[PDB]
Amino acid sequence: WIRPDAPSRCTWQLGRPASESPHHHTAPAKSPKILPDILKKIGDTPMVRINKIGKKFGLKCELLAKCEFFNAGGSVKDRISLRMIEDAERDGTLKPGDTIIEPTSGNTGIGLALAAAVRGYRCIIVMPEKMSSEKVDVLRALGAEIVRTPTNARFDSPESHVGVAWRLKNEIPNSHILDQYRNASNPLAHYDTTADEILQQCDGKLDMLVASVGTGGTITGIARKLKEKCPGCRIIGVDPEGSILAEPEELNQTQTTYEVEGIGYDFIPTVLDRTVVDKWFKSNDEEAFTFARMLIAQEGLLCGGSAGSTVAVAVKAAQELQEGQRCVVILPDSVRNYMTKFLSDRWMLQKGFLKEELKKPWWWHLRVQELGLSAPLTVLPTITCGHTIEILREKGFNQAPVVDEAGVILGMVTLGNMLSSLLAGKVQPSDQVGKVIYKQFKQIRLTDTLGRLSHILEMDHFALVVHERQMVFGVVTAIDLLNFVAAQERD
Amino acid sequence: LWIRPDAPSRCTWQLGRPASESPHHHTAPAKSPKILPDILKKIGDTPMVRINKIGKKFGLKCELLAKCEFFNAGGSVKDRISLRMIEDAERDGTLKPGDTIIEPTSGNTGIGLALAAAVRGYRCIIVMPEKMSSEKVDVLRALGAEIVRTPTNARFDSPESHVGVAWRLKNEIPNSHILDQYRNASNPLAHYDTTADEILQQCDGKLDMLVASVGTGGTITGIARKLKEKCPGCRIIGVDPEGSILAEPEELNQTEQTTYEVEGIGYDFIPTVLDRTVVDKWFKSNDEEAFTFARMLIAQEGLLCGGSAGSTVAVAVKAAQELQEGQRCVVILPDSVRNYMTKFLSDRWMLQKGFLKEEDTEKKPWWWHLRVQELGLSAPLTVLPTITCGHTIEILREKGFNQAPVVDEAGVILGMVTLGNMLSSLLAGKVQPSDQVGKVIYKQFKQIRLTDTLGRLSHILEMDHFALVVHEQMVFGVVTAIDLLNFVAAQER
Ligand code: HEM
Ligand code: HEM
Ligand SMILES: *Cc1c(COP(=O)(O)O)cnc(C)c1O
Ligand SMILES: *Cc1c(COP(=O)(O)O)cnc(C)c1O
């Protein structure tokens, strides 16, 4: 069992000529008209300007974002995943058909599983139980085997993702742990490609770089190349509360687990070089999710939580900067991984990140009863179509809920939809109503708030106002709510 | 005031007319600058990637190419028509700053419009069918769009249709516009001006067949017109889901079903922007093919694409059979998996909708149909949450055990504790020997019956590290993935 946190043997120091390096470096290559495979769609990520958030927090500087979620697997990890594989293949260590085992937060696991799916390697991912199910669905779709570990497990312990990875490797023939925590290919990928891209996109002019830290490879490779080729740039590292990566140690004193995925650790990875980070900042979950949501709402960037942590620090750290200067921020991954988490309001409420006291209009806190409802006529599912047309027209009604003999509501039926279906030949007048019933709806009480109705209308067209039996006091749609509000506008 | 989406087109284009005769304003593709002023500039210039396995699996002799449109900022092909429709409107003077934009949609156009709206400062109201995925709703809600739903089976003629509701909303809201993807020229024109140029440039002009799934029809129309002009020999193949009426000849459209699970393609009316005259041949697709093939695209080619992409490739492996070596077939891949994370990507959904037969287990190894009891379980010693750490260390060492489930005085299982985690926590000073075990407890686990299959266990281990074997109260044993591995490998020798 090799320790992920072993002190680095690298003899790099600022000032050493690049010629002195023992490592194999790879030049970035121009993308061909047609891509031989998707793995070539890694790198050359866009550098987009942040237009609102910085000014909202008083930055005078240009704030730029390196959007890494445009990589083929959707994360910054797709970079090292490729590199680590390719170098291994050149080492002769990785043979065709071989098994790759990797401890991960998920994104490296996705990149590796992707490359494995393409290049024909077996892939076993070992990730903590905290990480999102979306990553699991993706990994499962890529054909990767999945193993989980308890979140709070110490890295020293056998139950940790690293430990489980090694224990798996020992039992499986032709298996390798590329080990992102130790492999040089990880920071070197960012030293060779990512930093070059940043330097090229910025024309060499660059005042500050903010990056969240996990394995530390991104900030390490980028900071090393930046210290060499753009010495004045300040390197700002971001570490979650509960993590120990940050310096000075006094900052780390604190919670031990946190909701944000992909950053922070209970050990210092070998690839990480804390010497090149000029200053550290601590971040928390609330900041992270708040800012990520802000990134989406304001800048249109569909990025994940670490991106939010990063920007949340950047609006603080960049205050010292002034006009004409620029701050670049790394945005490690997409919202795809967190669709049911921070993107979801219910999860944010459930986790206590969103207080209910959720910016709303005057009508939000009003009861539905004030809408001016009218109780509709009810019909059986077994009633026939033309008959319903006659009933509805004869009473001047345009729609009727479909309720069972036992009084359970089955759905909704409309005059216009019926005429349309009949005129089109889709159904017969003698045909049963079930052929054209709108089966989907949601129920509400007279004492429900209008805003609750507004949330309900984002999933359903119809909302039936009902008693506690077969009793529909009224039917409300978005158009009705609109009509009420708009009528109230006229006064 | 209700304009029909299915009104016959007024366009007087016909193959052979000089481009100079066109009344429309055309936009040239531009080189992307080093730094993007905003994310909307990250639309277009989508990669053309080669399919390496699937075509050969189905006996294609030709080069199969994919125009991967899911790399657009909003994640779909619709981001193109969203930008264009807006920009043109802004040039028309029709769209004013701060104005409200209402749009009927399957979602992707709505996401692109909501994105652009969020950037450019428009109010955005999306009207989409109840069938469409919750993921789209979550994204639209995050982008700040107001959202309204309509019944899936509502006829387009009916007041309850997304089109009809969109118009009805428009009539009640001042300073509101419906850009209308179903009628607006900016939709197909966006594909004629940009997407098609990209395909032509990426293919160096050489292109034998193009397969595209159809929705509003703007993609296939805009691409096919320019292709018919600049690459006449290329065949245009359209994909239409069963239950839809877009396909020709009408004989193909005859079907029992009217709704289908696949999102973004097919309609109960012929959109004005669609030009069926340029479609050389149509193919009908179903949900099973679509999802199977989408999953195949992910599993084999590493392309994280949605269901319409699956429909398209599923057609392509049929339609391209006539092609031979040296010829190439280009396929459109409209959107990403992000919209379908909890649908076809999710195995439980595929089971629930009946797309996945359980039998097709058959893919699985020998040990899959074996009971958990055969693992060689041993019942562990349990401890109270309230027991202290060093005490437990002593008990476990004295018994030769390495771990103990933590069960309540009431006998509810609270979790798990391992000797190694305790020792590690102690040596690090995180905890004291006199400290409560609950400071170090592994709270998360899953239960299983002794009669459960090993494969079920294998599914469980993808969400939890520990699986407790239990009766109805009592823990017969603790199993991890390593234990399953040791068992299988042991039986293997
Ligand atoms: C002049 C430049 C450099 C020199 C001369 C150098 C030298 C070395 C040497 C000799 C080792 C192996 C030591 C041993 O195992 O005995 C090493 C390891 C390593 N290097 Fe470098 N290095 C340079 C730059 C870099 C850069 C720029 C990066 C990343 C951005 C990097 C990342 C690593 C990593 C991650 C290891 C593994 C450490 C370990 O296994 O303990 N190196 N380097
Ligand atoms: C020489 C080329 C073309 C000419 C002369 C032409 C002419 C026209 C004219 C005159 C109209 C409006 C008729 C009216 O409102 O009175 C029109 C509408 C339209 N055009 Fe074109 N067009 C050309 C090419 C195209 C192309 C290449 C596309 C898309 C790929 C296109 C898409 C549309 C659409 C969607 C409409 C709306 C139809 C309607 O309003 O009912 N046109 N075109
Ligand atoms: C890995 C990862 C990081 C951190 O990158 P390092 O290069 O490991 O610092 C941040 N965010 C996400 C989502 C990640 O997966
Ligand atoms: C819109 C859409 C299509 C079809 O595009 P048209 O250009 O409308 O034919 C296919 N798939 C998805 C996901 C879509 O959103």
PDB file of C-alpha atoms in Angstrom, chain B residues 70-206:
ATOM      1  CA  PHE B  70     -24.447  18.731 -27.354  1.00  0.00           C
ATOM      2  CA  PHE B  71     -21.259  20.712 -26.881  1.00  0.00           C
ATOM      3  CA  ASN B  72     -23.219  23.920 -27.308  1.00  0.00           C
ATOM      4  CA  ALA B  73     -23.426  26.173 -24.283  1.00  0.00           C
ATOM      5  CA  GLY B  74     -26.962  25.208 -23.412  1.00  0.00           C
ATOM      6  CA  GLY B  75     -26.256  21.615 -24.287  1.00  0.00           C
ATOM      7  CA  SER B  76     -28.488  21.264 -27.340  1.00  0.00           C
ATOM      8  CA  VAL B  77     -28.846  22.075 -31.016  1.00  0.00           C
ATOM      9  CA  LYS B  78     -31.525  24.512 -30.020  1.00  0.00           C
ATOM     10  CA  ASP B  79     -29.004  26.947 -28.647  1.00  0.00           C
ATOM     11  CA  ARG B  80     -28.377  27.870 -32.255  1.00  0.00           C
ATOM     12  CA  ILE B  81     -31.915  28.797 -33.167  1.00  0.00           C
ATOM     13  CA  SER B  82     -32.370  30.448 -29.824  1.00  0.00           C
ATOM     14  CA  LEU B  83     -29.622  32.945 -30.435  1.00  0.00           C
ATOM     15  CA  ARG B  84     -30.479  33.584 -34.043  1.00  0.00           C
ATOM     16  CA  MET B  85     -34.187  34.052 -33.464  1.00  0.00           C
ATOM     17  CA  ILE B  86     -33.412  36.548 -30.783  1.00  0.00           C
ATOM     18  CA  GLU B  87     -30.768  38.444 -32.641  1.00  0.00           C
ATOM     19  CA  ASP B  88     -32.871  38.801 -35.733  1.00  0.00           C
ATOM     20  CA  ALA B  89     -35.767  39.960 -33.651  1.00  0.00           C
ATOM     21  CA  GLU B  90     -33.520  42.513 -32.032  1.00  0.00           C
ATOM     22  CA  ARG B  91     -32.619  43.737 -35.465  1.00  0.00           C
ATOM     23  CA  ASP B  92     -36.255  43.834 -36.463  1.00  0.00           C
ATOM     24  CA  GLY B  93     -36.787  46.314 -33.684  1.00  0.00           C
ATOM     25  CA  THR B  94     -39.548  44.050 -32.499  1.00  0.00           C
ATOM     26  CA  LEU B  95     -37.686  42.849 -29.450  1.00  0.00           C
ATOM     27  CA  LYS B  96     -37.067  45.658 -27.002  1.00  0.00           C
ATOM     28  CA  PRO B  97     -34.853  45.593 -23.915  1.00  0.00           C
ATOM     29  CA  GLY B  98     -36.611  44.259 -20.839  1.00  0.00           C
ATOM     30  CA  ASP B  99     -39.326  42.639 -22.945  1.00  0.00           C
ATOM     31  CA  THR B 100     -40.995  39.321 -22.215  1.00  0.00           C
ATOM     32  CA  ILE B 101     -40.346  36.331 -24.453  1.00  0.00           C
ATOM     33  CA  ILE B 102     -42.827  33.484 -24.488  1.00  0.00           C
ATOM     34  CA  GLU B 103     -42.031  30.224 -26.239  1.00  0.00           C
ATOM     35  CA  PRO B 104     -43.715  26.879 -26.740  1.00  0.00           C
ATOM     36  CA  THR B 105     -41.086  24.133 -26.724  1.00  0.00           C
ATOM     37  CA  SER B 106     -39.947  20.599 -26.045  1.00  0.00           C
ATOM     38  CA  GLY B 107     -37.456  22.247 -23.766  1.00  0.00           C
ATOM     39  CA  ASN B 108     -34.174  22.623 -25.551  1.00  0.00           C
ATOM     40  CA  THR B 109     -35.267  25.733 -27.416  1.00  0.00           C
ATOM     41  CA  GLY B 110     -36.605  26.907 -24.127  1.00  0.00           C
ATOM     42  CA  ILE B 111     -33.339  26.306 -22.389  1.00  0.00           C
ATOM     43  CA  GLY B 112     -31.454  28.167 -25.071  1.00  0.00           C
ATOM     44  CA  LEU B 113     -33.838  31.071 -24.938  1.00  0.00           C
ATOM     45  CA  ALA B 114     -33.795  31.147 -21.166  1.00  0.00           C
ATOM     46  CA  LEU B 115     -30.026  31.164 -21.268  1.00  0.00           C
ATOM     47  CA  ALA B 116     -29.833  33.980 -23.736  1.00  0.00           C
ATOM     48  CA  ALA B 117     -32.516  35.780 -21.809  1.00  0.00           C
ATOM     49  CA  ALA B 118     -30.616  35.435 -18.604  1.00  0.00           C
ATOM     50  CA  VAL B 119     -27.607  36.938 -20.265  1.00  0.00           C
ATOM     51  CA  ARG B 120     -29.286  39.704 -22.226  1.00  0.00           C
ATOM     52  CA  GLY B 121     -31.895  40.609 -19.633  1.00  0.00           C
ATOM     53  CA  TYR B 122     -35.233  39.452 -21.024  1.00  0.00           C
ATOM     54  CA  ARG B 123     -38.116  37.986 -19.063  1.00  0.00           C
ATOM     55  CA  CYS B 124     -38.621  34.407 -20.201  1.00  0.00           C
ATOM     56  CA  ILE B 125     -41.735  32.255 -20.146  1.00  0.00           C
ATOM     57  CA  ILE B 126     -41.485  28.656 -21.284  1.00  0.00           C
ATOM     58  CA  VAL B 127     -44.468  26.550 -22.226  1.00  0.00           C
ATOM     59  CA  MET B 128     -43.731  22.833 -22.445  1.00  0.00           C
ATOM     60  CA  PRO B 129     -45.624  19.516 -22.413  1.00  0.00           C
ATOM     61  CA  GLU B 130     -46.118  17.566 -19.194  1.00  0.00           C
ATOM     62  CA  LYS B 131     -44.192  14.634 -20.704  1.00  0.00           C
ATOM     63  CA  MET B 132     -40.849  16.391 -20.784  1.00  0.00           C
ATOM     64  CA  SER B 133     -38.134  15.664 -18.240  1.00  0.00           C
ATOM     65  CA  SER B 134     -37.825  17.253 -14.822  1.00  0.00           C
ATOM     66  CA  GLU B 135     -34.198  17.947 -15.544  1.00  0.00           C
ATOM     67  CA  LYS B 136     -35.164  20.498 -18.151  1.00  0.00           C
ATOM     68  CA  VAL B 137     -37.420  22.082 -15.605  1.00  0.00           C
ATOM     69  CA  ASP B 138     -34.668  22.288 -13.060  1.00  0.00           C
ATOM     70  CA  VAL B 139     -32.354  23.909 -15.557  1.00  0.00           C
ATOM     71  CA  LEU B 140     -34.934  26.386 -16.761  1.00  0.00           C
ATOM     72  CA  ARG B 141     -35.779  27.257 -13.189  1.00  0.00           C
ATOM     73  CA  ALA B 142     -32.120  27.831 -12.434  1.00  0.00           C
ATOM     74  CA  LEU B 143     -31.798  30.146 -15.437  1.00  0.00           C
ATOM     75  CA  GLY B 144     -34.665  32.249 -14.168  1.00  0.00           C
ATOM     76  CA  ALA B 145     -37.369  31.305 -16.633  1.00  0.00           C
ATOM     77  CA  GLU B 146     -41.012  31.160 -15.677  1.00  0.00           C
ATOM     78  CA  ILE B 147     -42.435  27.744 -16.527  1.00  0.00           C
ATOM     79  CA  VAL B 148     -45.838  26.496 -17.664  1.00  0.00           C
ATOM     80  CA  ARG B 149     -46.842  22.990 -18.601  1.00  0.00           C
ATOM     81  CA  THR B 150     -49.412  21.535 -20.977  1.00  0.00           C
ATOM     82  CA  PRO B 151     -50.920  18.075 -21.296  1.00  0.00           C
ATOM     83  CA  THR B 152     -48.964  15.753 -23.550  1.00  0.00           C
ATOM     84  CA  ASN B 153     -51.869  14.404 -25.523  1.00  0.00           C
ATOM     85  CA  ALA B 154     -53.510  17.751 -26.052  1.00  0.00           C
ATOM     86  CA  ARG B 155     -54.142  18.311 -29.722  1.00  0.00           C
ATOM     87  CA  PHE B 156     -52.206  21.196 -31.187  1.00  0.00           C
ATOM     88  CA  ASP B 157     -55.545  22.608 -32.292  1.00  0.00           C
ATOM     89  CA  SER B 158     -56.800  22.569 -28.739  1.00  0.00           C
ATOM     90  CA  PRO B 159     -56.559  25.487 -26.288  1.00  0.00           C
ATOM     91  CA  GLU B 160     -54.572  23.279 -23.930  1.00  0.00           C
ATOM     92  CA  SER B 161     -51.668  22.686 -26.336  1.00  0.00           C
ATOM     93  CA  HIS B 162     -48.313  24.264 -25.652  1.00  0.00           C
ATOM     94  CA  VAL B 163     -48.737  26.357 -28.749  1.00  0.00           C
ATOM     95  CA  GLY B 164     -52.212  27.447 -27.814  1.00  0.00           C
ATOM     96  CA  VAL B 165     -51.331  28.194 -24.225  1.00  0.00           C
ATOM     97  CA  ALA B 166     -48.349  30.164 -25.403  1.00  0.00           C
ATOM     98  CA  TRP B 167     -50.531  32.338 -27.526  1.00  0.00           C
ATOM     99  CA  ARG B 168     -53.133  32.742 -24.814  1.00  0.00           C
ATOM    100  CA  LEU B 169     -50.435  33.889 -22.455  1.00  0.00           C
ATOM    101  CA  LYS B 170     -49.130  36.280 -25.061  1.00  0.00           C
ATOM    102  CA  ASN B 171     -52.509  37.926 -25.424  1.00  0.00           C
ATOM    103  CA  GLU B 172     -52.695  38.748 -21.723  1.00  0.00           C
ATOM    104  CA  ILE B 173     -49.164  40.069 -21.202  1.00  0.00           C
ATOM    105  CA  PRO B 174     -48.090  43.534 -22.429  1.00  0.00           C
ATOM    106  CA  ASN B 175     -44.716  43.813 -24.174  1.00  0.00           C
ATOM    107  CA  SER B 176     -44.646  40.103 -24.854  1.00  0.00           C
ATOM    108  CA  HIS B 177     -43.548  38.276 -27.972  1.00  0.00           C
ATOM    109  CA  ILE B 178     -43.697  34.727 -29.265  1.00  0.00           C
ATOM    110  CA  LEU B 179     -40.634  34.202 -31.409  1.00  0.00           C
ATOM    111  CA  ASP B 180     -42.233  30.970 -32.661  1.00  0.00           C
ATOM    112  CA  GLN B 181     -39.735  28.338 -33.719  1.00  0.00           C
ATOM    113  CA  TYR B 182     -42.476  26.653 -35.719  1.00  0.00           C
ATOM    114  CA  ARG B 183     -42.839  29.550 -38.116  1.00  0.00           C
ATOM    115  CA  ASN B 184     -39.813  31.805 -37.715  1.00  0.00           C
ATOM    116  CA  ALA B 185     -37.371  31.720 -40.581  1.00  0.00           C
ATOM    117  CA  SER B 186     -34.498  32.324 -38.208  1.00  0.00           C
ATOM    118  CA  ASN B 187     -34.763  28.724 -37.089  1.00  0.00           C
ATOM    119  CA  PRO B 188     -34.015  26.913 -40.342  1.00  0.00           C
ATOM    120  CA  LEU B 189     -31.912  29.789 -41.566  1.00  0.00           C
ATOM    121  CA  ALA B 190     -29.616  29.377 -38.612  1.00  0.00           C
ATOM    122  CA  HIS B 191     -28.900  25.867 -39.792  1.00  0.00           C
ATOM    123  CA  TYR B 192     -28.581  26.920 -43.406  1.00  0.00           C
ATOM    124  CA  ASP B 193     -26.085  29.622 -42.616  1.00  0.00           C
ATOM    125  CA  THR B 194     -23.980  28.069 -39.864  1.00  0.00           C
ATOM    126  CA  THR B 195     -24.498  24.377 -39.165  1.00  0.00           C
ATOM    127  CA  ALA B 196     -24.428  23.405 -42.811  1.00  0.00           C
ATOM    128  CA  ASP B 197     -21.338  25.457 -43.502  1.00  0.00           C
ATOM    129  CA  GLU B 198     -19.669  23.700 -40.629  1.00  0.00           C
ATOM    130  CA  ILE B 199     -20.598  20.305 -41.912  1.00  0.00           C
ATOM    131  CA  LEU B 200     -19.429  21.208 -45.385  1.00  0.00           C
ATOM    132  CA  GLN B 201     -16.140  22.573 -44.158  1.00  0.00           C
ATOM    133  CA  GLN B 202     -15.478  19.691 -41.826  1.00  0.00           C
ATOM    134  CA  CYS B 203     -16.195  17.251 -44.620  1.00  0.00           C
ATOM    135  CA  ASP B 204     -14.158  19.156 -47.196  1.00  0.00           C
ATOM    136  CA  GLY B 205     -17.252  19.227 -49.355  1.00  0.00           C
ATOM    137  CA  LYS B 206     -17.319  15.476 -49.618  1.00  0.00           C
TER     138      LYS B 206
END
